[PDB]
Design a protein around this ligand. Structure first.
Ligand SMILES: O=C(O)c1ccnc2cc([C@H](OCCN3CCCCC3)c3ccccc3Cl)[nH]c12
Ligand SMILES: [Mn+2]
Length: 291
């Protein structure tokens, strides 16, 4: 009954010539990545943007996440508190190392993935984590340099800088993750693309569904969702659309997975449902774009 990992989504390692334009590159890999919903892009080895957030002033109040909140269906549990980037990392590393009884970097990604989905549906164990998930790049700056040192100028002007993506048909948002912090199944507003960059930290685990199976996923969601949420509009239902990928796979929905490591991009395609969780303390940046 252990979690069965979905097949891996495509991973592209473009050369420096192919890495010249994101929209041109995504358009060329489209015939394959469109059929998997998500794909991972590894930039060339020497493409390393320096972290450009104001780490000194970085303070945030993460949301509280109870992993088994849906299964517990059949409000003063924990208030939201303020962290700094360093104090949140100390809390995140202490939680994971105490939970697995080993150094955080020695915990296999398959074990965290297996334990996360066990905790989501567990009724005896109540695990509660925190996620810095409502942080705009206007708050303390983007993780990318934005027009800086001369060595940073190439990255401030790069097309893969998420601040330089075409967003007209917003600004990038930031995610400070810890172990077991997660985001449930959803598509973007206007069925837009989304591009996600992990600046540093432990990997972010993804699950994606191709757009041609979008209506099949919504059917399975509606059938198995709690009856009180079944009639809710999609924008509100998407706030609690947590579902084990094996359940979707058992109902014929194709699901692909990947572990997004530091310095790697993840692109979601139009109407491609996606979800995931963080393996540990990390820092991500994401923005929607249209083609
Ligand atoms: O956490 C990731 O890395 C990640 C990757 C891809 N898509 C999403 C979508 C979210 C999403 O954030 C809500 C808020 N933000 C978006 C809307 C504007 C404000 C900022 C979320 C957070 C936690 C639980 C559920 C969800 Cl849906 N997080 C994503
Ligand atoms: Mn998203």
């Amino acid at each position: 009954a252990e979690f069965v990992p979905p097949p891996e989504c495509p991973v592209f390692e473009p050369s420096w010539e192919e890495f010249t334009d994101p929209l041109s590159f995504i358009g060329r890999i489209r015939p394959l990545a469109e059929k998997t919903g998500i794909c991972k892009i590894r930039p060339p080895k020497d493409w390393q943007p320096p972290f450009a957030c104001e780490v000194k002033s970085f303070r945030f109040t993460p949301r509280v996440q109870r992993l088994n909140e849906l299964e517990a269906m059949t409000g003063f549990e924990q208030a939201v508190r303020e962290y700094t980037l360093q104090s949140f990392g100390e809390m995140a590393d202490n939680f994971k190392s105490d939970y697995f009884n080993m150094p955080v970097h020695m915990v296999p990604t398959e074990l965290v993935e297996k334990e996360f989905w066990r905790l989501v549906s567990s009724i005896e164990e109540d695990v509660i984590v925190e996620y810095g998930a409502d942080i705009s790049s206007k708050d303390f700056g983007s993780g990318f340099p934005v027009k800086i040192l001369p060595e940073e100028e190439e990255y401030a002007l790069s097309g893969w800088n998420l601040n330089n993506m075409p967003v007209l048909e917003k600004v990038p948002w930031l995610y400070v993750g810890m172990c077991f912090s997660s985001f449930c199944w959803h598509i973007e507003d206007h069925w837009s693309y989304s591009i996600n960059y992990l600046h540093w930290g432990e990997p972010k685990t993804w699950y994606g569904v191709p757009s041609h199976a979008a209506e099949q996923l919504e059917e399975v969601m509606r059938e198995l969702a709690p009856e009180l949420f079944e009639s809710q509009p999609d924008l509100l239902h998407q706030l609690v659309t947590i579902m084990n990928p094996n359940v979707l796979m058992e109902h014929g929905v194709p699901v692909y997975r990947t572990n997004q490591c530091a310095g790697e991009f993840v692109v979601t395609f139009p109407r491609a449902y996606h979800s995931g969780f963080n393996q540990g303390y990390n820092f991500a940046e994401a923005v929607n774009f249209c083609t």
